[PDB]
Design a binder for these strands. Sequence first.
DNA 1: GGCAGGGGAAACGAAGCGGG
Length: 151
Amino acid sequence: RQPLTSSERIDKQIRYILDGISALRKETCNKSNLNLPKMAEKDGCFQSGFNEETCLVKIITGLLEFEVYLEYLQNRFESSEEQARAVQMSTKVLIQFLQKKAITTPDPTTNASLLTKLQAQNQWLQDMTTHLILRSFKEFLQSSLRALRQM
DNA sequence: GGCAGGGGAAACGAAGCGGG
Ligand code: NA
Ligand code: NA
């Protein structure tokens, strides 16, 4: 195993998670309100108006915000239990990597109450909710990846 | 630590690397 710089470790970590999510989406899509984080020009991650210092802040912020929804995913893939867990843990690893390359920590209790609301919804909305966490996490990560390759 | 960091990767958005 050749040694990887920080940036290289980060690039591989995101490709790892993107792979895991893809595996969950197949288990979702074939078996077929929210304010999920999203990239916007203000964040300065796109080519138009790129700023590294604030982009990295948005990525870490967005990922910390994504954690409640990854926790929600754990009890929606009973057989793919291992795969949801891997996505949840790898993302926590990713945050830890990004925090050394670098703000708004989500409030635990606000998260915990949102979680039990999502968990109480009826099956149909729950299946809708799963699909869009996956889709939106994907897009935040693809965009995070595209960014970080510049930094 | 160590054997090494922090239990375990090219076609037009399929193919296929390690216990306490
Ligand atoms: Na080890
Ligand atoms: Na160890």
